[PDB]
Amino acid sequence: KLPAKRYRITMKNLPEGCSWQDLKDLARENSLETTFSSVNTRDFDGTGALEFPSEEILVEALERLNNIEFRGSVITVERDDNPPPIR
């Protein structure tokens, strides 16, 4: 796989109305502070994205959120780095 110089991750398999406020609530309550959040309600893809101020919370929250049962659905988190081109 490729490296990553950030502290953000994306969620998948989360077909719920969990909005920025929701994910932010559970995140902060689960010992995970985030500075940025985002979700996709426009479609039924059930995928979100969160970011932490530090890497410690990112790796921890990622390993603590990765593969989790919620509302009868198994949600998973995976980092996705998409930096700019070389030009």
**The domain spanning residue 22 has which CATH number?**
3.30.70.330
Residue 70: C-alpha distances to residues 5, 26, 32, 55 (Å)? 30, 12, 17, 25
Give ∠ CA 64-69-72 in degrees, rounded to 5.
165
**Cα–Cα distance for residue pair 52/34, rounded to 1 Å:** 4
**Cα–Cα distance for residue pair 65/62, rounded to 1 Å:** 5
- Do 7 and 53 touch, CB atoms closer than 8 A? yes
Domain containing 39 equals: 1-87
Domains in the chain: how many in total? 1
